[PDB]
Design a protein around this ligand. Structure first.
Ligand SMILES: Nc1ncnc2c1ncn2[C@@H]1O[C@H](C[C@@H](N)CC[C@H](N)C(=O)O)[C@@H](O)[C@H]1O
Length: 384
């Protein structure tokens, strides 16, 4: 599994976590989350009602004892050994299709990069990513020719994915806005913000609106949430999420969030779920980002942070979060915040790990908490 991570990043992890822990993290990082979480949209439905609805579809949701809005599914797999060499013709899926197949998705024709020419419908085939990673085994539903030419349709019915997560996008319950897929650390993030109906609230990197709509339901569609993103398409997707979830609480604004103080707003609560190297996301088939990205991105996040601090009322609260493992983007950038008049505060929910040489910030690790790698800092602005 180590091959999935560039050598200098591996040295970095060993340095930052210790050889043993670093190895446990990387190994788990290559696998999908063991507990696949969704958020109950309490704007439309209760947890127990939704559970009943999901059981109807043959799904087995489990309750979180920490998040009354939390449900999760237990991951299946691995369904074959890491060294398994099936005696089967190969279908090569592109980088994106391979990752979804890795978690139980079917392989559709546009996802097919190339294939063995002997393949006919009904043949058993193995599916590999462009680097030879075996991600699944299944039955071809197209001949070789149609597979490499079709613009739509089923190419391989994946009957033996390496891992299996439930597909929730096609459920009636999803179309009716009953839930929103979202990791446990992400849900904790919104709770720890403790949004109030009175608070002036800003999500300055909000699309596609996962944490924003979570705040919305905690506010019970009262108050107002200002949600900022630079991307119009991602804001376009966020508009759809809002409508589906029945969120009436949110004001969208397109802009570079680093220029946030250009508004005349002094917020009481700011969520900064900052763009990051995403070193913690799962599954991690191949890590492309490395040390140069950590420094550049960390420096890039500071602009957001500074913008937020200047836009906070004194006594105001900032919650900073990333889906990355690096020190620089996390604890290092919090030290930055501490030098700029911010004070660390106890978070209301703490089920993860302590930070690196740092007490009140919260980390999540895939090997310890069955989640993506994650980081949460909650700060109070004591002075300007
Ligand atoms: N300078 C920027 N200004 C505003 N938004 C940005 C900027 N750079 C990146 N973003 C957005 O930051 C977001 C990063 C997302 N991963 C955040 C997801 C969000 N927290 C959610 O709960 O769904 C993307 O939507 C980016 O479009």
């Amino acid at each position: 599994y180590l091959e999935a991570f560039p050598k200098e990043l591996r040295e970095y992890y060993k340095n930052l976590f210790g050889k043993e822990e670093a190895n446990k993290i990387m190994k788990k990082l290559r696998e999908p989350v063991e507990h696949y979480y969704i958020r109950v949209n309490t704007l439309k439905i209760s947890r127990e009602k939704l559970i009943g609805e999901l059981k109807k579809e043959g799904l087995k949701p489990l309750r979180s004892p920490y998040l009354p809005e939390g449900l999760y599914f237990v991951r299946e797999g691995p369904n074959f050994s890491d060294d398994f060499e099936p005696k089967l013709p190969v279908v090569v899926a592109n980088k994106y299709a391979a990752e979804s197949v890795y978690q139980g998705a079917m392989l559709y024709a546009p996802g097919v990069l190339k294939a063995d020419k002997n393949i006919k419908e009904g043949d058993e085939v193995q599916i590999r990513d462009p680097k030879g990673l075996l991600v699944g085994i299944g039955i071809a539903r197209m001949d070789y020719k149609e597979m490499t030419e079709a613009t739509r349709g089923l190419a391989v019915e994946v009957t033996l994915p390496k891992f299996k997560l439930p597909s929730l996008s096609e459920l009636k319950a999803f179309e009716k806005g009953y839930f929103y897929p979202q990791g446990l650390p992400s849900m904790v993030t919104a709770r720890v913000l403790e949004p109030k109906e009175d608070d002036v609230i800003i999500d300055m990197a909000a699309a596609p609106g996962g944490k924003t709509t979570h705040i919305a339901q905690l506010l019970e569609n009262k108050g107002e949430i200002i949600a900022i993103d630079k991307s119009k398409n991602r804001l376009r997707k966020m508009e759809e999420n809002i409508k589906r979830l029945g969120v009436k609480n949110v004001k969208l604004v397109q802009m570079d969030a680093r220029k946030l103080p250009d508004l005349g707003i002094k917020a009481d609560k700011i969520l900064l779920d900052a763009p990051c190297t995403a070193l913690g996301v799962r599954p991690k088939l191949w890590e492309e980002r490395t040390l140069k990205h950590i420094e550049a991105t960390a420096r890039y996040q500071r602009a957001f942070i500074w913008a937020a601090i200047k836009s906070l009322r004194r006594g105001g609260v900032l919650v900073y979060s990333t889906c990355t493992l690096s020190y620089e983007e996390n604890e290092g950038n919090v030290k930055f915040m501490i030098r700029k008049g911010m004070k660390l505060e106890e978070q209301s929910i703490f089920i993860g790990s302590p930070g690196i040489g740092m007490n009140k910030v919260q980390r999540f690790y895939p090997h310890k908490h069955l989640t993506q790698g994650f980081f949460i800092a909650k700060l109070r602005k004591v002075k300007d």
